[PDB]
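Hi D.,

Good news: the full-assembly prediction came through. Inputs first.
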Amino acid sequence: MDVNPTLLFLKVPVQNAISTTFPYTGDPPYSHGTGTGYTMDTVNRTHKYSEKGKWTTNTETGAPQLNPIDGPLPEDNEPSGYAQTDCVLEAMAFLEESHPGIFENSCLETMEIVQQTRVDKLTQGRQTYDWTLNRNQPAATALANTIEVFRSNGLTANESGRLIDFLKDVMDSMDKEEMEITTHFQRTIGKKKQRLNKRSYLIRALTLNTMTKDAERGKLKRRAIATPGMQIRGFVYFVEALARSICEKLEQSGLPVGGNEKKAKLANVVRKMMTNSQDTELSFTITGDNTKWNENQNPRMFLAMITYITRNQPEWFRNVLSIAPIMFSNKMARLGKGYMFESKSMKLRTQVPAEMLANIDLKYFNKSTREKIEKIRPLLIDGTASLSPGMMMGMFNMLSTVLGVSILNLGQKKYTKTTYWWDGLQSSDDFALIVNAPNHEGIQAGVDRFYRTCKLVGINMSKKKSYINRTGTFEFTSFFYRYGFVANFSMELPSFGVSGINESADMSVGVTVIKNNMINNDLGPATAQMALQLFIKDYRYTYRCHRGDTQIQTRRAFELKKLWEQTRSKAGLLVSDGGPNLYNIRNLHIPEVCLKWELMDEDYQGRLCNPMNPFVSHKEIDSVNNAVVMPAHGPAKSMEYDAVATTHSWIPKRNRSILNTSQRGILEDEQMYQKCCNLFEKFFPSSSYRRPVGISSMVEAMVSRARIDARIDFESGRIKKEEFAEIMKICSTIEELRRQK
Amino acid sequence: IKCMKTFFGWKEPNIIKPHEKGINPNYLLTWKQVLAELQDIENEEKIPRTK
RNA sequence: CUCUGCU
RNA sequence: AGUAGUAACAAGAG
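Then the structure:
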């Protein structure tokens, strides 16, 4: 009697039990050590798929560049980056013809976005490469460093607050003959200044930082991802904005819509294909990813698509949209941390930075790394490898799906000019293509035509992990369609458990996750009760907030027991204070504070909901009652939760490991910046709720506001003559401090 | 400790299945040291909770 | 002897 | 030793 869970599929169809095929209960495979090997492998692989292209040497950066555009046509089914300019232009032209005015309307919408977009938009996003520090920094921090460097270099055209002005400053910076930056060296703190030549700054402005994608499920081997610099992101935002505007106007483009919007759009489109197909016509659906999609999406083709899309538009708009593909076509990839060398005989470790691989001897490496270094050495320049071809983890997902949907629209009977035709859905590298043809031979001919056309445009379908079946069931971006999308709960299992925001936000998020899974992922009511019980147990263990009546011993047990004895109405206690769990299927949508409000003791209610408690801290409105959640698959998600701000809405300790590094000064600067901003809010309460405006320094605004507030308070009598006198004298002293400096 | 006080059949430990790449005497000494530690804890009146 | 446990 | 797997931990920086 050998039990075999897989045999369950003999009765339950695979899709209906697809959740069993997801091991997401276990830990995801993480990456150990450096990502330099993965970056080198990616660069070599990208240059291998385009080897038959043209080799040139950039005249500005001096690095070799490879152009596969209009290269020899593919002669084999392997991935190939030889995209044809004529074919891509033809695909875009036919997309325009089939969807008249799409490019024009999208261009105008992008025009208004470009007009009304501010520099602060670049603050969104995470782990942005900071060229000034040669490391990844938070997007806001990298933006601030770049702005400060530009100001110190005379690029004082960004104070207008418009992103386009910042882009103008970016170009002016690249055109400068020299640059000055500020770096800290400790040997004692030294605020040294470094001078960068034109070529070095150019190389470090096109540089693309690389790391290893961690916690990635479904892949045995780890892969390297990349994040761009501050200069690139500005133009990338506009490019993406235009591509997303175009995508929203395409029925086959489901990328911009997400979640249940994505599922509904895909369901409607597949239903339309099943409907408009002739009854007598044989219908098939292909499921597949595109092999080496990111490695083959050349940026020159993106430049061609942008130039075609921006036809007849104002020349400045064409420039703003086309700059990003230009820069990416001349991009560079940082290698990363480097490698680690060990000596067993002498029993010692060492880390060799990736910048010194262009000269280190090859005897220190194993065979695989030996050949990767040998192959990538020609492209190494100033610690970075030239990666002109391909798109290393490109952010042009929107543009790439525009190209895919253009090729997908090429399958209309007015374009195929044959009995067979095709349509489907495209999203980044994933696609689900439906072929209708009178007979199986027609289906095969249509499949071959689509595959060959994709090869022409540079899209390489992955024959390895793609398959065709009769229309009705398919898969698309981890969404399994079986005559209708089926719920796959295993995807949302990692979201369960303690989120780790705070006691209140984590209770609210847990109950909201259970409720959302009931609504969307077919979480039954009994299983919902199970999930609630398990989440409460995990929450109590994590937060050491077991019920006071329990004998469990923990460093927080004494206080909870004292509170339990103190309270008269036990039911009113929150779970974070040893109170019982009153949640159920009925009230998963009610915050615990409001759920237990009537049961709370008056004094306990006041203490818990005291607005003057020091635990609660409020940042800008954009970071209130919301959290960032990372699903098993997909990008970061902004989850909003309903929670009453109580003493439990505290902040966890901040990682202090930067205190014993040469770059502590940034932390100090952050502290001071906060010290200033919080005072500005003390003078302008609405600064947090909505961003303030003005050109004057903070000191001028604060002192003027203080003076006027003093006069109004005096007139209303809220302050006496002496208080007004002291306020005025302090303001005059502040003025004198500003003047003297 | 109480659970160990429930079985009265222990005896001098001996290596029956060696660890090919390990140092078996080290494992035997580790077990003996753990037994000694828990015995010292038992006969001791102090209350070490995280021995 | 001090600092750090995602920097 | 062992974890682990294409590169690392088996403390690191002063």
